[PDB]
Amino acid sequence: IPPYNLSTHGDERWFKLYIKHVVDNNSHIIYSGQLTDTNINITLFIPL
Amino acid sequence: KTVLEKSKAGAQSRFDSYGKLYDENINAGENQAMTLRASAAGLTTAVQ
Amino acid sequence: KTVLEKSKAGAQSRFDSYGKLYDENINAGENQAMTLRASAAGLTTAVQASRLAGAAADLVPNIFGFAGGGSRWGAIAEATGYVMEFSANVMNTEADKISQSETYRRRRQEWEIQRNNAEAELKQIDAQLKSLAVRREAAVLQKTS
Amino acid sequence: KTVLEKSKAGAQSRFDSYGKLYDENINAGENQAMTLRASAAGLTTAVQASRLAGAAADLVPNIFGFAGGGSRWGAIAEATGYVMEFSANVMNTEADKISQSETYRRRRQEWEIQRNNAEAELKQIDAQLKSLAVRREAAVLQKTS
Amino acid sequence: KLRIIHNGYEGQKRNQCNLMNKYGKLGDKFIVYTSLGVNPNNSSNKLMFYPVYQYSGNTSGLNQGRLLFHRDTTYPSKVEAWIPGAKRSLTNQNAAIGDDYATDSLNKPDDLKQYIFMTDSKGTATDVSGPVEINTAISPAKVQIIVKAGGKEQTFTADKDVSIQPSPSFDEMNYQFNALEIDGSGLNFINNSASIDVTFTAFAEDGRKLGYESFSIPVTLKVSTDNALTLHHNENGAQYMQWQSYRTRLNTLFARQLVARATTGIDTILSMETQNIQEPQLGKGFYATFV
Amino acid sequence: QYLLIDNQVSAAIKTTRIAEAIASIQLYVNRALENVEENANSGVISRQF
Amino acid sequence: WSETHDLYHDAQQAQKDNRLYEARILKRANPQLQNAVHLAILAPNAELIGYNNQFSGRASQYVAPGTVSSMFSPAAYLTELYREARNLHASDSVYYLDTRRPDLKSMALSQQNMDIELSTLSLSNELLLESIKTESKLENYTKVMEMLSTFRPSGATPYHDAYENVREVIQLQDPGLEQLNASPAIAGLMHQASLLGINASISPELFNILTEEITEGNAEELYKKNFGNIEPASLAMPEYLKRYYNLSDEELSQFIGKASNFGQQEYSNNQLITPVVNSSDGTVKVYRITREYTTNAY
């Protein structure tokens, strides 16, 4: 995840990861976090 | 006089303690302990 | 004065000992001893549900073919006989719990008497230290005389 | 002086007795008594593994030929009933272990009080031997007078 | 899979690696001051600053260098980095809590490779010494894996044996290699077991070692010229195990012949004639006396 | 914690020269093993002693 | 790696065999065992010869328990402590063992160093007297005490050691100064500022400090005489003053009041001290506003 820049993200630091087209064409949330000044390494299991 | 008044107030505390224990024999707990031992042995005619 | 200060320091050691025993009743060990006697006798409804289930299962015949039958006819009377023998052990376990709980109560009530015997002796030796302080002042006035 | 030296030699015999009992708590005998109560209640997982193995072995029919069957249908309810009756004896064995372990703890705490009663009496008689040594010096000065 | 972290040794070096992570990218060059001590004249506590200087113009596009620092004080204060050798001061009025910087007003990094006095004029003073210029860029040609499997060392670098180079980062760099070729012929099999010593290591651009991590892959060889272990029960009562040439007794016939020694009493059981009770030989063989 | 000997001790407390040099080194090791005094040699901490 | 792993576990096994072989010599050479004939414990007598030739007859010299030359003396534990712990830090470090304590390597492992009791505070003073004697490069411990008698800057340092030997004997001969009243014509010879030094620990150099005339002008000159190279902006901090004079927060607040690091000042004991900084000059000028209530306090 890239660090927080106000010009390309906005005034709020929240960010969410969604999964889509896995069992239906709708979306489902797999992560929710807050942007910082440092990268965030996220390792997730993606079902198929 | 203060020496014997502290001795009198100490022997009064034993006469009030052991007198309370003598006047109040078997309490609500120790009544239930001997009731259960009278109920655990009244099952001879029922088991037979 | 040194004689009564060693008597005061000895009665203080009993007031601090029996007062610590009175303030700190049932410890982490003796709590677990009465919890186990409360848990060993809470199995009456569970054993009875296993005796009544084992009795009715044995009333069904188990031998089939050219020679039928096989059910134990005295299964209900065996089950009710086992529950009433086990409930006699439950009532003895419940009686051992309360008799241990009241042995510990009477132990605390004797600790309160031994606490108050040391407190009355501290107040007695403190009054003997006061009269000895007056006996010394009457000896200094004799020294002045 | 001989009166207080026999009192000092008597309070020394209590300080040496209760001090030996306080320093030497649980002996080679009373260690084996609480080891056996810890070993008599560590058989819960072993008895349960024999009741569950005897229950499933008796659910297999044992009579074959022209008349089949023979399995005891209430075998699992008999096995779970025997474990819960045996676990009531385990919880009473575990409670007797802790109640014996805490009876021995309160026995040591009374030995500490009786040790400190003799230590305070040794320091009291040693202060009475000092004032008697001053009472003798006031009697030698009267002899000089 | 080779993994590189840029942090280390929580006292005095973790707070300097957090400054490179927060205020810099991996290809930057820094000055790490490896000798930090308090000034006994101007300090009233044992806290200190942890300075790192960042250069001007690198992977992090920066027009002008700046001196990073980290303070353990929570009160608001200025932070002044006085340089006695260059007669220049880098001062940050109203420093933030923890990580903050003081920009370098004229780009001469060679005035910073000497003694710096950092203070806040409210209790903290630090004798900043021992500058070390580092280059934190990493090329994959210097990231190698050393495999010493028996005879000859085999070195596999990351420029040829990685399909996808990861992004540069101070936090994690996972170097997943391909299926590497190890010549297992020539292993030293001592007690039917060998080993393959795999050593991870990596180097930076200025030649400093980034640490190492040694592994070991145990290889066990199955021999086929031996016989199986065999349990025997001779007709004299002796049981033994046949490990290829030897015979090792399993049971004893002591309790069979103890019964005749136990009819009289314990004085006969615990004598030496009971301790001389013999046991039969293990199968076919004989007794020989060698002088 | 540095000179490994007590300066705020009273003058009525007595040791010997061997038993104080023991307590100096025992105080020295307990600071060196637990990262109180920095740059301790890790190859010596992992010795059998 | 596994080449090192094989040689190191072979080195542990050879180290355990050296402990057992040296034990078997020293067990069976015991005169406690040789007097007991019924044990039938065989002396070595063939590998005992090779042990005594190599180690100068070590197995014939046994000692009583409680001596210094034993294998289990506290001098034998101090030797294994000093052998292992001297390499915990690097040789160029300030936390090196022979750097902080140069007297440990030079101490004799004698019977007199192990039995004879002496004060820990006497051991601590002669360690401090030796370190001051080498840095100032003085002659003996008397020149150290003469240097401390006139040394101004530090917080408890104007310590005239011969003076405390004088004033304490006077506190031991007549406690409470009984001869201050019984002999007025000798007490009249001494000025009352000098008789203050008998009750209160006021050195003859501390009398020179307390009676200086502090004016504008010499205040910069008397500062370097009384404090040295301390910068006055760093001396005036309350956290620095607490550690310098060995004070506490309640003991310092009677002098400089209530202070904090957030730029605020409060009245403590009805007085205020504010280092008011001067704009456009940079100088620091200290005020002292002191309050007394009239017509009510609360």
Add this chain to the structure above:
Amino acid sequence: HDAQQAQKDNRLYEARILKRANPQLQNAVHLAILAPNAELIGYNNQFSGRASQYVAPGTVSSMFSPAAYLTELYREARNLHASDSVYYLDTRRPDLK
């Protein structure tokens, strides 16, 4: 019930600031308890440096003084009766406020 959950989150977020800003914890190096140092900045700018000012137990300015229990008592109990009542708290006791 959304207002109760937001009220519990305000108690936990303010706690996590004041726990990890403890000088009792900052002297112990071996705990490795990380100071916030990024949301501690926003807390001290809003509340005038509250998380840097800690107090000793037994003072009046604490969060657990008896003056802090009296403040929560007077805040809640002053509205038990109506303002025009004779049993109003500031009517019967004008010296409490």
Add this chain to the structure above:
Amino acid sequence: ANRWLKYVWSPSGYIVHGQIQNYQWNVRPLLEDTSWNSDPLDSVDPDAVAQHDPMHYKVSTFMRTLDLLIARGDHAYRQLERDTLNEAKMWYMQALHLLGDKPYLPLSTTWSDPRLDRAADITTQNAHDSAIVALRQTLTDLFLPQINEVMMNYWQTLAQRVYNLRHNLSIDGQPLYLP
């Protein structure tokens, strides 16, 4: 008891096959603070708060290590020998460098001694609650946060135990010298 406290936390590190390790906390979900209860304020539970924030499991293990060092040094005190009081001083100094120095609290604070209606004013409270929501996603009459009193008693006990060691007293303060 030292052997089982070092299965959670060893301040001297861990040695696995002749090499010191990178961690002092043997429990890796204390090494990374993983919350395993996100509803800690449903009931009054001191453990469920510590499950939401596992740093209190660090402070609890820290306090049990201190209770080990103090009670062992109290045991080594009451032998009243020469080398046991010097042993007891070692276990007291070992508990002092785990605590570090005593915290220097600032003595002047932003506390103006307010009125009771100024401190219990609801617009002070509603400005306080709305400011936390602005941080999560004038007020100077607030109450200042407080250091732990039970933690403070560790510095006060160890300052008293060493004071009795340095001045030839008993553990209760009674003198060991003859009057």
Add this chain to the structure above:
Amino acid sequence: HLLGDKPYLPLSTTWSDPRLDRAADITTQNAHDSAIVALRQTLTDLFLPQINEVMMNYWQTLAQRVYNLRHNLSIDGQPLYLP
């Protein structure tokens, strides 16, 4: 007579009261370990081996018990005669 006589220990030994760095010198230790391996298959700062203290208390108890027997005392040392 099962113990035999009390062991006569030699009183003068090869003990020169060495410095602490002379006794804790590693080349003294490595000459000690390499000499045992030469025996299994200058150093005079070594520590001398020691008799058993618990065994020594048997000679000291029995010398005290017989002393109380020979001089009309109790087992604790108190006199059995009338002062």
Add this chain to the structure above:
Amino acid sequence: FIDWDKYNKRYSTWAGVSQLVYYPENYIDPTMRIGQTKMMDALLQSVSQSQLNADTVEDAFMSYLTSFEQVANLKVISAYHDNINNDQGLTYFIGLSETDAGEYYWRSVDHSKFNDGKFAANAWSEWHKIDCPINPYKSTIRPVI
């Protein structure tokens, strides 16, 4: 005022619950915990005696680790969800131990505690034991509410 009679009437109770958010470690007991398993209760009773050496605490840990193995090796057979829809409500599972004539457990997961792609650990309860003579045919067993 709902909490008035407990934790708001007295000062000593108000400072108890309000410090429990900030410093709960003053109230954390290592031997007692709200929500501990029955294995931790059986572990505390195995070490509740006084003479407690290194051999006893290792035999009690392996007796703890034996019961830990039975719960970690459970086989989930079937389940039932106590709602119409899968998004809300709570689902009850059922387990199987690795013993012959096995024993069945059950627990819950709360779907209202599902937040951001993962259940919170408060959704899960502990495995509760079923003392019932159960012997289904080819894992044909269902919970239901």
